[PDB]
Design a protein around this ligand. Structure first.
Ligand SMILES: Cc1cc(C(=O)N(C)Cc2cccnc2)on1
Ligand SMILES: [Cl-]
Ligand SMILES: [Mn+2]
Ligand SMILES: [Zn+2]
Length: 453
């Protein structure tokens, strides 16, 4: 009645040994956690990264948020210190419930959240912080610089120090030379009571990992990757405004929606309260949303393992939706092949398999455009072009392996799926621009095979 809490997601308590390597651990829990979309990881009891900062010198610009179910919000985008925000946040929650903050049951805040967002006549608005790490506001984890205490240095090189996560050997998003600071740098989140994150999945269907440094809990709802399209069909029915096309990445539209609505619609949903010192991990294409129970401070980062590689290719195939890419998946694959000698051997083996598919698809696409009467061709170093200068005019995909150009439309490109969409000139006026010949590509893949042995 009113709100039935979804079942709890899995909670893992790894030993110091299991905990040692995050990527090995994540791979281990994957068969369980991928069925629920999110999971919680409790670190071993003594793993306690020191959080220290001045609440007066850290400044940030707050976002403002209206709390209405099914209303469109833009996913990314006054001035507080951490202290003045905290004072605002505590007073807000205290006044809302006429209670001291620690006496307000989490179950009640959850019930109340879903009451207030559904109720038209309540116009509750809240504020929050969300920015990537910078000099005005830096990571909650120890970083290198200022003299560090011995305990801080203990955690400098932790796998679970979220600064290190994108640049470890197991991960594939590291050696991406391309500018993608929005998604390989950690984001910092300053929460207050009811401040919420709308239903979404991560760019390129990556994993994410969220650490709550301190404060009151963060409540999560998650849906397994296998159910992503079920969820979207439900959302399209109840809020079609979110699904109209949108000129870029800055304008992705998202919304608050009751998990019970999804569960009625046969979409599996799980929940958890994430407390201070705990991790939440989201898996590829796992929808998630949630809200904060009170004043808190979280840090999160995207990442990609070898398990993710085939999904990353399927994700870019964005093409059907005409959605912008954050980076070129093929460019990343070829960059890794060009570094085959210093790659991890398991990485090498998995990249090799994705590369083989890439090459077979590219062979077929080039044959098709040849049969359309595109004859002239020229090598082109796509990776040198700013991304906005190498998007398919039609489907907006970021080109790297190849594209079609025409002298009559200088600077415009289409991917090889959209040769007919470039201009009205006959095909013999077109040029195939390619990064590599098929003969360049087979030795690159062979280097991976030798490294993988
Ligand atoms: C508005 C708005 C902002 C978001 C969002 O995405 N946030 C705050 C980031 C986040 C926090 C926790 C987990 N995943 C993402 O949604 N609506
Ligand atoms: Cl409301
Ligand atoms: Mn997220
Ligand atoms: Zn295209």
């Amino acid at each position: 009645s009113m709100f039935l809490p979804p079942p709890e997601c899995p909670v893992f308590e790894p030993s110091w040994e299991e905990f040692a390597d995050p990527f090995a651990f994540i791979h281990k829990i994957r068969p369980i956690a991928e069925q629920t979309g999110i999971c919680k990881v409790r670190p071993p009891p003594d793993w306690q990264p020191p959080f220290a900062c001045d609440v007066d010198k850290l400044h940030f610009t707050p976002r403002i948020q209206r709390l209405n179910e099914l209303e469109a919000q833009t996913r990314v985008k006054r001035d507080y210190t951490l202290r003045t925000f905290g004072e605002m946040a505590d007073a807000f929650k205290s006044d809302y419930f006429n209670m001291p903050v620690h006496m307000v049951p989490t179950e009640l805040v959850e019930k109340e959240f879903w009451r207030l967002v559904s109720t038209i006549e309540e116009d509750v608005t809240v504020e929050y912080g969300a920015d990537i790490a910078s000099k005005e506001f830096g990571s909650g984890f120890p970083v290198r610089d200022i003299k560090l205490s011995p305990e801080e240095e203990e955690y400098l090189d932790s796998g679970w120090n979220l600064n290190n996560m994108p640049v470890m050997e197991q991960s594939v998003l590291a050696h991406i030379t391309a500018d993608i600071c929005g998604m390989k740098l950690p984001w910092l989140y300053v929460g207050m009571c009811f401040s919420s994150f709308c239903w979404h999945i991560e760019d390129h269907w990556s994993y994410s990992i969220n650490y709550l440094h301190w404060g009151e809990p963060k409540t999560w709802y998650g849906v397994p990757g296998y159910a992503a399209e079920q969820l979207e069909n439900v959302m399209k029915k109840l809020a079609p405004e979110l699904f109209v096309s949108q000129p870029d990445l800055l304008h992705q539209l998202v919304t608050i929606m009751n998990p019970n609505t999804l569960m009625t619609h046969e979409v599996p949903v799980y929940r958890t309260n994430q407390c201070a010192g705990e991790f939440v991990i989201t898996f590829p294409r796992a929808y998630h949303s949630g809200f904060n129970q009170g004043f808190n401070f979280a840090e999160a980062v995207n990442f990609c393992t070898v398990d993710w590689l085939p999904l990353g290719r399927q994700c870019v195939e964005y093409r059907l939706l005409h959605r912008y890419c954050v980076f070129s998946h093929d460019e990343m694959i070829c960059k890794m092949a060009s570094k085959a000698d210093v790659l991890d051997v398991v990485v090498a083996s998995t990249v090799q398999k994705d590369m083989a598919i890439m090459i077979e698809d590219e062979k077929a696409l080039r044959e098709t455009v040849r049969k359309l009467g595109v004859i002239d061709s020229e090598r082109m170093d796509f990776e040198l072009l700013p991304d906005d200068e190498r998007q398919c005019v039609k489907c907006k995909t970021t080109c790297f392996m190849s594209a079609i150009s025409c002298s009559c439309k200088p600077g415009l490109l289409v991917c090889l799926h959209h040769v007919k969409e470039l201009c009205s000139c006959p095909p013999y006026k077109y040029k195939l621009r390619y990064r590599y010949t098929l003969d360049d590509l087979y030795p690159m893949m062979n280097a991976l095979k030798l490294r993988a042995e």
